[PDB]
Design a protein around this ligand. Structure first.
Ligand SMILES: [K+]
Ligand SMILES: [K+]
Ligand SMILES: [K+]
Ligand SMILES: [Mg+2]
Ligand SMILES: [Mg+2]
Ligand SMILES: [Mg+2]
Ligand SMILES: [Mg+2]
Ligand SMILES: [Mg+2]
Ligand SMILES: [Mg+2]
Ligand SMILES: [Mg+2]
Ligand SMILES: [Mg+2]
Ligand SMILES: [Mg+2]
Ligand SMILES: [Mg+2]
Ligand SMILES: [Mg+2]
Ligand SMILES: [Mg+2]
Ligand SMILES: [Mg+2]
Ligand SMILES: [Mg+2]
Ligand SMILES: [Mg+2]
Ligand SMILES: [Mg+2]
Ligand SMILES: [Mg+2]
Ligand SMILES: [Zn+2]
Lengths: 25, 68, 98, 132, 215
RNA sequence: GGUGAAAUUCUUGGAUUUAUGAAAGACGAACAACUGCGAAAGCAUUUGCCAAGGAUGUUUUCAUUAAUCAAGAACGAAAGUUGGGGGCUCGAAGACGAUCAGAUACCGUCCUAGUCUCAACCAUAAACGAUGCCGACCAGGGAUCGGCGGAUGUUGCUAGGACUCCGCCGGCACCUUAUGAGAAAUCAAAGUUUUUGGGUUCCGGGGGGAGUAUGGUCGCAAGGCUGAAACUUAAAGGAA
């Protein structure tokens, strides 16, 4: 996978964690 | 001239003439004074006998100057 | 592997060069990298000079010329055969051909 | 009110795009249209509206109509699309100009009047250009 | 059918030029609410200076003539600016030399507000060995300053008629080339373009000064 | 009109095309270069004003005041964020027309944010010469940019400018070559290194997991900076 798009995939995955963790705080 | 066809201690007087003033075996200025009341060849001041420039001051055609 | 000493462009002692747009496809390309050709030809093709000269309404008249500066991106210059792939030794020759 | 031998000059505005050809004849002021025939009026397919053959037919109709109005000489003002688009005249410019010369019209002063920006607005297609 | 109701008119050029038979133009015949004279007034005609002057050396210059009045069948025009042909300018702009351009807004003695555009190029010396003849930016500004100064003086004193008489022989171009030679030798010094920004309101008396009785 | 060909789309209520004129906003062609300036990012229409700067010139002055730098600071393309102005062109998203087995694409048509500007943030790029800075030394050659020195006779020119020849200092580079270096490509530095030491900062230690998790910190956000382990694997990789 092109490195730029793998970087994009990880950033999306980090947003969900950032939102899936602040949901319970 | 090749390095081995020249003597560093006794270079020709013409070679040292065209070398940079700071790169000669002994540093020597290219400037000098002259009469007209002495005037510096590279005067930065307006004497109108001499007009300062980026190098030697521009002398006037009228008067005659004698190097000293 | 580094293919060219100039990196494919002509830039020394400056940071940024504004781009131009390829005359063929409109691709953005730095002006120092684009292949530039200045075409000067008669506004009337050689196949029609005789007919136009016979129909001239003036005893004397010089047919004007058509000046066009063409700036190609690399892909269009190669595809249009403006330039060709050269051998490793011939890449260094910068003088224009005959 | 023209005596024999005198030339009555018109101005032929030839717009030779890569999709169509225009042969527009006016007076010296460009404010009175005489005849306006395009390559699209002489063919059936869109792909042939800019062809040299279509431009030849359009020029023959323009020459015949000009003789009816007393116009026997034409100034040529050729142009490409111009602007930020291609500056190269289309494939119908040479055919149109040659056909006019071979129809009794006396060609006057030829000039290129493509609109050239002295800079320009951004060209379409994006910075990567048209990708074929 | 529509062209059967159009009357042809002859275009007349001012007395400054040699040939006055510029050409012919038509317009719909006078009808209620559409006067023929109103349709021809302020019509701009672009004709080569080689036709007005009957000299093929002036083929590179175009003259803008606008119709002022319509006396009978003749359309009386007047100078409305000039410009180079596209081929002329493109032949002068070459690589390995400096291009110098200048513009200036000036008012003649006839209240004509002009905007003259000058152009010049650096010139090589006969014995020059280096391939380029570039001028330093400071030299370019000195040259451009003299272009503006000379253009003001030639137009601020003379009237429009006398000013146009200087454009035909390019007297202004020679004076600029003679004054700037001490800064940098120049070649192809021309008044590239002249615009009319503000013309005085029409006055038939002055129009007929440069036009004869074409009757 | 547009395309490989088309269609969406516009059009006898006058489209496209031609002339004149006005408005708007953007952009600054040609000249324009193996050219210039800037710490880098970057900088290209004229003229004025404001402060700044390199180089050159100097028989001016101070006299080691320097080099490189943890911490800590200034600046930092584009995109993006907040609000105001502006809103031509182009144009993510979106919609449609094609193409196709499918086509959320490439091609075409329309268009939102954006693109421009002001105030305030963000601090990242193949931000590249993929090469940190200061110093010395070590081949040849021509061209070019800035300044200066010398020589010289021409200018539709007002001593000087333009050009010609010799040289000096500084700069962007290029060409030939190895007596050098290197895994080689190649490099006049990437040379003067097992014959190993001029000074100093940053930084790497098989491939992945991973610039991920976690904690801290900065940010309005987007994210930035700092940054693991478990586990997995016998190659991955460079040049030719
Ligand atoms: K190139
Ligand atoms: K900052
Ligand atoms: K040098
Ligand atoms: Mg490769
Ligand atoms: Mg520099
Ligand atoms: Mg860059
Ligand atoms: Mg292709
Ligand atoms: Mg000079
Ligand atoms: Mg420059
Ligand atoms: Mg410009
Ligand atoms: Mg730090
Ligand atoms: Mg920024
Ligand atoms: Mg980084
Ligand atoms: Mg790096
Ligand atoms: Mg550092
Ligand atoms: Mg760096
Ligand atoms: Mg020099
Ligand atoms: Mg080499
Ligand atoms: Mg060591
Ligand atoms: Mg490792
Ligand atoms: Zn292209």
């Amino acid at each position: 996978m092109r490195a730029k798009w793998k970087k994009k995939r990880m950033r999306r995955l980090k947003r969900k964690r950032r939102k899936m963790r602040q949901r319970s705080k | 001239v090749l390095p081995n066809d020249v003597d560093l201690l006794n270079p020709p007087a013409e070679h040292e003439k065209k070398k940079h003033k700071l790169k000669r075996l002994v540093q020597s200025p290219n400037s000098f004074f002259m009469d007209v009341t002495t005037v510096f060849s590279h005067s930065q001041t307006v004497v109108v006998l001499c007009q300062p420039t980026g190098g030697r001051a521009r002398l006037i055609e009228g008067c005659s100057f004698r190097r000293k | 592997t580094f293919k060219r000493r100039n990196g494919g462009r002509n830039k020394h002692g400056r940071g940024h060069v504004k781009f131009i747009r390829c005359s063929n496809c409109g691709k953005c390309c730095p002006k120092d990298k684009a292949i530039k050709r200045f075409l000067v030809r008669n506004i009337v093709e050689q196949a029609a000079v005789r007919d136009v000269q016979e129909a001239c309404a003036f005893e004397l008249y010089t047919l004007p010329k058509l000046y066009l500066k063409m700036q190609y991106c690399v892909s269009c210059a190669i595809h249009s055969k403006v330039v060709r792939v050269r051998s490793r030794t011939d890449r260094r020759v910068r003088e224009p051909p005959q | 009110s023209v005596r024999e031998g005198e030339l009555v000059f018109g101005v032929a505005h030839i717009f030779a795009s890569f999709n169509d050809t225009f042969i527009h004849v006016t007076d010296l002021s460009g404010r009175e249209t005489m005849v306006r025939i395009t390559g699209g009026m002489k063919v059936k397919a869109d792909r042939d509206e800019s062809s040299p053959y279509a431009a030849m037919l359009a020029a023959q109709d323009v020459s015949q109509r000009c003789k009816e109005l007393g116009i026997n000489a034409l100034h040529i003002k050729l142009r490409a699309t111009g602007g930020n688009k291609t500056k190269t005249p289309g494939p119908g410019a040479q055919s149109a100009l040659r056909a006019l010369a071979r129809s009794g019209m006396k060609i006057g002063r030829i000039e290129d009047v493509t609109p050239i920006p002295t800079x320009s607005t951004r060209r379409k297609g994006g910075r990567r250009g048209r990708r074929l | 059918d529509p062209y059967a109701k159009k009357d042809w008119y002859d275009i007349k050029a001012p007395s400054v030029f040699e040939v006055r038979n510029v050409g012919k133009t038509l317009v719909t015949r006078t009808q209620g609410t559409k006067i023929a004279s109103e349709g021809l007034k302020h019509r701009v005609f672009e004709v080569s200076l080689a036709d007005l002057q009957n000299d093929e050396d002036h083929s590179f210059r175009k003259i803008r003539l606008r119709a002022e009045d319509v006396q009978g069948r003749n359309v009386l025009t007047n100078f409305h600016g000039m410009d180079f042909t596209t081929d002329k300018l493109r032949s002068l702009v070459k690589k390995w030399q400096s291009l110098i351009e200048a513009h200036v807004d000036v008012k003649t003695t006839d209240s004509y507000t002009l905007r003259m555009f000058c152009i010049a190029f650096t010139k090589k010396r006969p014995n020059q060995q280096k391939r380029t003849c570039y001028a330093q930016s400071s030299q370019i500004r000195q040259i451009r300053r003299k272009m503006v100064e000379i253009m003001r003086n030639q137009a601020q004193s003379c009237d429009l008629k006398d000013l146009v008489l200087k454009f035909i022989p390019e007297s202004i171009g020679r004076e600029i080339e003679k004054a700037t030679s001490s800064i940098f030798p120049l070649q192809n010094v021309f008044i590239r373009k002249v615009k009319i920004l503000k013309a005085p309101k029409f006055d038939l008396g002055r129009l007929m000064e440069v036009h004869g009785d074409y009757s």
